[PDB]
Amino acid sequence: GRSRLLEDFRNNRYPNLQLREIAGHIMEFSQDQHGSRFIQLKLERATPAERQLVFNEILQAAYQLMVDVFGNYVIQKFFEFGSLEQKLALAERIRGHVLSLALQMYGCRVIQKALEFIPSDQQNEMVRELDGHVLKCVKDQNGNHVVQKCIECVQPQSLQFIIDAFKGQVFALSTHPYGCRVIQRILEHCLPDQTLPILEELHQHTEQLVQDQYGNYVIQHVLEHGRPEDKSKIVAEIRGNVLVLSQHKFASNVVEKCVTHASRTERAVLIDEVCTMNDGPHSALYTMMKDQYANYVVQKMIDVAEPGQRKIVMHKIRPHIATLRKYTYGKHILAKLEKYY
RNA sequence: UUGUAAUAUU
């Protein structure tokens, strides 16, 4: 199958092998496991002139190498360290294949690499081909990364269609394993008038989103990085739901995050809520102190409360210390209290 | 010795 030259190379019959010596075998070498690594390493220390000799052969069947397990690496090397003309010639080779490459395990890596190192006008050409196929890519294990790289590297103006695709889909994709990460890149990069519709749908579903295994991360992203107004809407939804949401595997992390990033006044109001709520027989606090998730929340409130409110809370916990030692998760409240005592 | 993130390529 291979060439004597490639078989001989695989069987270490060439310790002094140079790129010059494999002219005419570049394609075949690029598709070989060792051949590819050989080319990748020699190219790192090749003069611009030597790199061009290689490029001449990789150009014609560029597509064939882009979708190849090993050949994709040789292509990306050229986006990383190539002349402008080489990078344009490769972007010209990608033209009309963006989507099919994006949805492919190796091809997608070439695309991501290209977005990072081609000129803005060329990025804009490349991304146009994703228009109509956003959801397909976002849901895709490989494609979703191409989309994230678009958001990171491309002028936000060129991506209105991403936003437009997400309209009515925010909830669906904030609860999707790959869509949630895409939402998190949008909140980070896309313009205010572009996040605006995204934030609107998030606020409409926050109670539900905090209880999702992925959604909860979206809501916490806003609590950590968003505008004060956004943070406020979120804490307000959480507030009045602290007791139940504190006992929920997923949303319990969101109540902690609200406790950390809420205004001093908001934080105090949330801590006050659990202090004054009475879940039947005993306090909502008591319920939380023996719960598997909420014990964390209570400890969090202890660490972030202003000293005066922390004291009140501690003193309110005191009456139940003897009981708390019997329940599995109680030890953890007591550990925390002991730090402060 | 208490609780959640994407099996993304040589």
Q: Identify the residue whose tokens are 């986006």.
A: A79
Exposure pattern of A211-232 as b/e (b: 16+ CB <10 Å)? bbebbbbbbbbbbeebeeebbe
Q: Which residues contact A194 (CB under 8 A, 6 or more apart)?
A: A156, A159, A160, A163, A186
- Report the distance from CA of residue A108 to the C1' of nucleotide B8 in Å, as an integer: 10
Q: Which nucleotide's C1' is closest to A183 (Cα)?
A: B6
Structure tokens belonging to residue A172? 């669906």
- Report the distance from CA of residue A280 to the C1' of nucleotide B9 in Å, as an integer: 56
| Inter-axis angle of helices A48-60 and A71-81, nearest 10 | 130
Neighbours of A64 (CB within 10 A): 13
Q: Identify the residue whose tokens are 């956004």.
A: A230
Q: Nucleotide B9: nearest residue by CA–C1'?
A: A106
Question: What CA–CA distance (Å, rounded) separates A101 from A105?
Answer: 8
PDB experimental method:
X-ray
- Biggest CA pair distance of chain A: 85
Q: Identify the residue whose tokens are 């997608």.
A: A108
CATH of domain A1-341: 1.25.10.10
Q: Give me the half-sphere count of Cα atoms (radius 13 Å) on the Cβ side of residue A274.
A: 35
- Report the distance from CA of residue A219 to the C1' of nucleotide B5 in Å, as an integer: 13
Question: What CA–CA distance (Å, rounded) separates A111 from A95?
Answer: 11
User: Which of strand B's nucleotides are less than 7 A from any protein C-beta?
Assistant: 2-10
Q: Which nucleotide's C1' is closest to A332 (Cα)?
A: B2
Phi-psi region of A278 (alpha: psi -120 to 50; beta: other; left: phi over 0): beta
Give me the residue spans of the domains in chain A: 1-341
Structure tokens belonging to residue A266? 């908001």
* Resolution rounded to one decimal, in angstroms: 2.3
Three-state SS letters, chain A:
CCCHHHHHHHCCCCCCCCHHHHCCCHHHHHCCHHHHHHHHHHHHCCCHHHHHHHHHHHHHCHHHHHCCCCHHHHHHHHHHHCCHHHHHHHHHHHCCCHHHHHCCCCHHHHHHHHHHHCCHHHHHHHHHCCCCCHHHHHHCCCHHHHHHHHHHHCCHHHHHHHHHHHCCCHHHHHCCCCHHHHHHHHHHHCCHHHHHHHHHHHHHCHHHHHCCCCHHHHHHHHHHHCCHHHHHHHHHHHCCCHHHHHCCCCHHHHHHHHHHHCCHHHHHHHHHHHHHCCCCCCCHHHHHHCCCCHHHHHHHHHHHCCHHHHHHHHHHHHHHHHHHCCCCCHHHHHHHHHHHC
